[PDB]
Each structure stands twice: as C-alpha cells, then as structure tokens.
C-alpha cells in the first residue's frame, strides 16, 4: 500500500502439543507479498517496551524498512495459560512457535532472534532444536550453562545475592497482575519490600535453607537450587553447551567486563567460531550503569552506550543472512574492545588475540605480608627464601564485597575503591615496584597457589587491582575456590589437615594499560559476603546448620624455591 | 485494542511553509478525543525521552488518538531554526488544522517533559477554545528566570554552553551529505562535553568562534543581553496565567533547575481552575534515588505506573466529561525527606505555616567550620562584624545542587571537602532534643559592605549528620547592581552599609534528634553562576589581568540584626 507505514494486532492465540495456548503481538508493514520476521520471547509482560529496550536497539526501524516483527509472554504469566517454572519448558515452546510461523501467509520462509539477560538465554534453547528456516541469532549478556552462570560457578559456591534479589523481584510482579485479590496480598508486599532495600540482611539468617516467604510462593527456589550443590543430574539436562560445537548458525555476541555473565558470554564465541560467521563486541559495563560514569572513576562520553551505531549493525547483519546480499557486511570488523587505562575503542582480527605471551608473576618478601603496610612483593624471578604467611578466619567476621561483577546487591559501581578494607588482618598484600614503561595486560586471567589448612574444609580467594599516584586502589577481576571441589564439580571428596596441596583459581578476563607511575597489585584471603556465601569449616551440609555450630580455622599460605606460588598474566608488546 | 501508524504527513503554516507529523490512530465506528507533542529531538526517537514520562500506548488501547511533530527547521520539517520565537503561532495553526479533520469529535489535550513543557504554555495563551487540557512535567514560564539567568540577576554558564553543544552535534549528524570541516568539528564539541568548567573558564567571556558560528543566538541574544529588558519581555507569558481557566497538571523535582518557576504556576492558576501538584526528590538527570553518599529508598524511584493510571482518570474528566473520575485522588502529594515518606495535603502553601527568624551571633571570628559563628530565636545582644577577602581568580567551586550539565547527577551532597577555607563563613545551632520540620519557600536577610562599586553575595542551607556527613538542601545569589530592580541597574559606594534580600527556592525537611541545623555565606558559587570582575564595567569584555579583588563585612548584632527565615511546621 503505503512503504514506510504499518499495523498492530493484539492477543493473538498460539498453541502446544499438550494443549495449552500463548499469547502474542504482530507488528507489520505494507506490503504486496509475503515478508522475513524476528522473533523475542520475554517473562516481564509483552505491553511493557520501554523498560528493556534502551538496553538493545530502536528496533521500530526494522518495521519501517520491511521487516515483521513478534513478541511473546511466556508459559504461565500475564495473558499465557498454564503453570509457571523457571528454564524446564522453554526447549519445546519455542519449537512449536518457530512451527507456527513458518505456516502463515505472510511469512516468506526466512526467520531470525534478538534480545538482552534472560531474554537473551532463550536464544540458545531455541538453536538446538533443529528447524529449517531459523537463519541467524544475537544474544547479549547471556550464558549456555545455568550452573556455571548466574546461579553457582567454575569454582563451586552459591551466588547468594544473586538468588534472593531474582526471586522477590518475579514474588512482586504476581501480586500487582492480579484484579481480584487474595487475603494475605496486602502483608507480603511489605515484607518484599524489605529484602530488596536490605539484601546482604536477608543473606545472614540461618539456617539458608528455612525460608517461610520466598519458599511458599516458588518452591523452585528450594527444591532446585538450594538443595543441589553439586553438579549432578538434575542440572546437566537443561545445559546446552556440549550440544553448540555440531551446530552452523551464526551469531552476533555482546558482553561487559563488570558484567555477571562476562564468562560464559565469552566461551560460546570460542565454541562456534570455526562452523559458521560469528562476530563480538565488549565494553566497560555492569549490569545495571551503562553510563559510563561512577563514584570514583569516569571512562569519558565515548564509553556511554552507542544505541544507534547498534541498530546500523545489527540490520546489515540480517540483510546478509535473511536477504541474501553478498556484499552486506564490507568494512565491518570481526572483533571490537574498548581498552581501559588509555580509555579507547579499538580493533582486532579474533579472541583469544594471536600475538599472547603467557608470563608468570612470584610471590616473596622478607617478613610478614599481612595489610598494605607489610612487606610483599611480586618479580619475574623466583624467590631465594623459603617462608609462609599466618592468619585466622571466622565466619561470624567475614570480609565484606566492594564492586566486581556484583548483580542486585550495590550492582551500580564495579571500579570500586579498596582502602576502606585495606587493614584488616586476615587481607594478604603483594606488589611491584613503581613503573618507568608502561605495561599491557589483555586475555583470560588465573592463578596457582601452596596452602594447608587446620579443618577437613575451607575457601580461598584472589583478586587484581591498579594503583594510582594519588592514592585510589582500583579493582579490575576475581574468582574462587571451595576446598572439596578442588579436583571436580561432580564427585567431592574431604581433605586432610595439615598437608599442603596445590591448587588452580579461575579469574575471568579484563583488558588494560598500566600506566607510568602506576603498580601492580594482588590481595588473597578466604572469604567474599555476601558475592558468595560462607564456608562453616566443618564439612558437613552448609546450607542445614546453624551459625552457633560453625567454627574458626587457622590457613596458611606457602612461598620459595621449593614451593613457587605465582598469578598468570597475558602481556602484549607491540 | 488494535490500531495503524502513518508517517510523514505534511502541514501548512500562515506563511507556507510545512511541517512533519506521525499519526497514531485506533480502530473505532467513529470521531474520537485527539492528544498533541511538539519535540526537537527527532519524532522518529520516541525510546529517548518516553521513560522520563509516561507507558502512552495505553491511552491508544483505550481510543485515544496521539500525534507527535518536528518543530521548524529540524529533520524532517521545512524553514530555519531559532530557539522560541515561532512556537506561539505554529502551535496555534497545527490546533486550527487537528479541528478540522474527519476523526476529531472536538476535544483536545497535551503532554510531555522540559522543553515538551514549555511548548504546552506557548500554546494556553492562543485562545483557541478546543483545547481542554495540559500536563507540564519540569517546566517554567519565564525564560530569563530559567533557565538562562535568575531571580538574584546573575549568568547560569554552564546550562548554556552545555545545551548549545548538544543541539550542535545533532546538526552535523543529521545531513545528507558531508561537508569538508564536519570531522574537524565533532572533536571540538566532544572535549567541551568532558569538562564544562574548563570551557567556562576563557576570557573574555564572549569570544566563542565555534558556538557562535553554529548558532549565533548564543551571542547575539544571550550574552549580549543581561538587563531584563525589551527582547527578554516578547517571548515571556507568566502575566497572561491568571485569566485564562485551564486545568493543569503540574510535577516538579526538589533538586531540579527548573523548581523555582514551576511552583509559581501552580500558585497562579489554583484561584479559577482544577489545578494539581506532585514534587519528588530528583535531579534533572537523575531520577532513581540512589546517590554517592545518600540513598531515599525503593519507594523514591520514578513511579511509572502509578503516574500512567493518574494521567488517564484526568483526561477523562475533562475530555469525556465522566463527573466521578477524580474520585479519592488529592489535590498536593509531596515526598518528605529525614523521614523519608510520601504524604498528601489541601493546598501549597500549607495552611498552617509560621515563618520564624533565626538570628547570627558568637564570639569570635566566623571564618571556617571551626570558628565561632552560632543561630538562636533570640536577638544577639553584642555589635560585631566578619570580615574576608575575594579574588576572582580563585572562586568557591560548586557542589551539587540544582545543577544540570556540569556534574549534574549527585544532588544532595557532602559538604566536607570545600568548608575549611578562609573565605567561608559558617553558623550553626546546638545538638538537638526534639525533631524540627521545615516546609515551605526560604529566604534571608542581611546587613553588607563593600571597598568596591560592585560585588555578589550568597547563601546555603545544609543538615549535620552525628556520624560527620554535611548534606546540602537549598541556595541562592544576589548581585547588588540589580539590589532594587532587574530593570534599572545603578552602581553603590564604598564604605555604606545596605539592607539586602537573597532567593532561596524551596524544600522539605524533618531534622532529627542528635542532628544540627547551619548556613554557609560567601561571594561566589562557579561555574552554577558567572564571576563578578568587581570593577563596575561590562562583565563579559573584559580579560581576567583587568579585574581585581575585594574586601568584603557582614555586621551582625542589636542595631544591625542580619537573619535567615524558616517556614515551620508543628502538629
């Protein structure tokens, strides 16, 4: 009819193989023929746009240019029938849909997805089904294994935080989206309210497991994921990542250094890679600033997100794969990072970058290393003498979270200032000299250390920081290991006391320059509340007992010729 | 609940030139009630500015018509670009146009935030009588008041060249096809938006060869012009306010730097119309509730919905003529800090309030936190005065506040940092027993002299907290020139003593058991305001080796009794 106009129909029924029927919006242009269509599926109700699309893209430039577009409520909530629980349905729901459309008139046979967080899981599901006419995907800030992101980790301790915000906020989006209301409505929203303005309060009650609110309203959140550890059978079936390497979709991937999915985000671009046209954008982000600005570090205006240079990318990308216009994707680069310290965008041909040298920092020090007063040190060289640094843990006193990769809980400010707990006695500090040249560190980061404890359990911890001339101690990345997990996340075993073991801590990635007049620094210890929870030192089962039956532990950490503990970094030099 | 958009529909003004319009429109049998937007920010980009308002598409899926424009001489419009001048009369011929059509049944209303604010009063004083209602979210209704000048007759420089560079950039993205000398331009204007008091800092003042050749309104109007004179008087519309008759639904923000006008509208239209009033704690570019060294709650955050279901009972009333709509809904709902509450109320100003003067006294210098400057109910029986010294080179940076650009985002904060220096003046009462409430207007009263023929003055309200937090609440600038009137300036002499009056906006506050109540006075407060030269010449001409310094008194006592006044609550 008229190129540039369109239509909107609402509450359109779709249904299952079981029975049950979902609801969607179709939004679509004039036209004289049939037409290509996306697809988003989305559990915080289909009305609502403006509350995630300024994360994304102005996709209303999609319509205008030809394209359909429809948005979906998933099983159980709002205009959809049916019961509603977390992951187990979201496989065969979102065959059924792709199902539906590939029969109507107005498609032309050609299909594609887009969209952020949980929005962005349902993406993956949707790839290993197998059907035909789904030509292309674009998940952000997303993962393809549930256990290693966002609910547990590489390391073996539960996200506590992370659990208890999630819940309350999905608790209060069912009692506003009712019209005849129950009895009790009234006092649970107070009590709601409560743990969203306190949440590290909320992580201190025990038992973990005794939880007479959020367990009457989604038994879920016990009978799933509290009550299962380890990873075992009831969390290998709703993984998709060994499934990826047979697959030949491509796939446009986005990510945030302070993010709590950078992880896995970065492991599925390594996994499918080599089989189809894959493509990967990160900058500076936590998951809920994407400003550009905090308390006390500004990375400038070019770092705020870049909206409309998204939406330009995303709808060359289409029309390759979806139009079939060979020449579609020319002058666009394969991967693009925003490098801290000199704070610019900058291009590369492929991750992990080609160039990498893979260099050992040691630790030493003559006398003891406790606070930032003491005396450690980090070289190139091994260390001539041969020592150990001594302190003590008790999990009613546990060292407190300052910025990372932190979701609900003070989730605004992720370069966080680290001298409010640089005197503590149970904080470990090592560092360098004051530079002359400057120094590039851009990859995946680990370390391995020499320890012994006092109980059959117990956690350490590690952490990389940047210090400025002016006295601010900046963080950059982190990780964790629990004891019993050392050797697999699926078959634990008890430790001995007062042997010494040798060990690996997983700590993400980062991209950064040191700059001259500047140090390297690293701090160790054995806890992070309420970013993980706390270890009890007993070795019984943590999440059953009471805080008056836990016990203190006195850990160790071993240096020297014999025994070289050291951090693994990875140098450019150009 | 389904509907259709058309894009691209041109219209006629007076003098033949047209403007662009999109069109919302819902399935219906037939005529329906019609809602407007005028916008400079491109009509296409609705994701932009829709999160600072309203979830609109719920008045389309309940038969609302909605169209939305691109004002003259900007991306899809014909004709050229000046800020304010034609948006009476292009407002006043779109109207006559809506009426006109097939799908209107006769009633039309407005909305929208800022600049889609002020538009809604440029189109109140046409007369057209099809226009039934208006809703203006952070707005003013006189120019020079906000936010370009103020009440105390000092240049707001860093709400200037901040806004002049961002419509800027939106000019060179928006062409067709490139010009040679773009690139160079776009690095320029990124390093005035990454430190603004840099850029305010070059003298003289009015020498800008890139803003002036971009937009040569920001001399030729602006700068130019710091009388309250002729030009400024054209494109003011307060003095037409009061009889009109048009209801209004007004909003407004405690730290915001459009507050002081906003709620002067309100007190002007309450008298012959259904007026009503709402006021958060939020600044222009913040409006979450969560700050670097104060947090207000969850309860603070922009409420979205709430204000999505208030919006729609109001245009049914007026509109559709439903007599019960505004059942149970009040008329004032306010946001008090300390407590950290909401609370409705009958009217603004509150029907029970006491203005009660606090007087300045103590033994000893004032200079500095650690002196001995004091505030009691009860006249000071000794004849004193505090003495200091200013120089134009090294000024009192600003710290929050209501300011919009430069560091807009950290309204109420610690004051620490800056009140140890030698020209800072500071009094405070004692500890207190029992919690004091302030709600209302504030303002002060002081006794002054100078050794020069022309100088400023200022003053700040802040609340000592017992764990050493100093929060900042509210604040005000008078320059003596304009002591008397805006209008008419004449210069003073050295050695006098005069009687002067300071415009310290609004808040609401309950000060706490085991809290302090003080006030910080000064001569200077930059970039929020400009720099006075001291020598009673033409202030924006002049270079910084040509100005000199001041020594400046307060006088304080029983002839001469210098205060400030509160506006107290008690139940």
Redesign the interface.
Known sequence: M?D????????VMVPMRDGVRLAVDLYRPDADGPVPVLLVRNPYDK????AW??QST?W??FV?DGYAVVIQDTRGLFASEGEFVPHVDDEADAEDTLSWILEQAWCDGNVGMFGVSYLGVTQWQAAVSGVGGLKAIAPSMASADLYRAPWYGPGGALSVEALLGWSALIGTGLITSRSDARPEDAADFVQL?AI??DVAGAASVTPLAEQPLLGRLIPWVIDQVVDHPDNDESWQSISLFERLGGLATPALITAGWYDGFVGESLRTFVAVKDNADARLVVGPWSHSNLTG?N?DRKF???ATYPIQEATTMHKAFFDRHLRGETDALAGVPKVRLFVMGIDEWRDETDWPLPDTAYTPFYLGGSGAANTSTGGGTLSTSISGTESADTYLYDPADPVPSLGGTLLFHNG?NGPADQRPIHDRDDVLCYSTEVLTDPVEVTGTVSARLFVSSSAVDTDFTAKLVDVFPDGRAIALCDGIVRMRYRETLVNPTLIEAGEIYEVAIDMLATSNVFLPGHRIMVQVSSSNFPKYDRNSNTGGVIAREQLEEMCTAVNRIHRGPEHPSHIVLPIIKR
């Open positions: 008229v540039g106009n369109y239509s909107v129909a609402s509450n009305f609502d746009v403006f699309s300024t102005n209303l430039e205008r309210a969203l303005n600005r308390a400038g205006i070019a605004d």
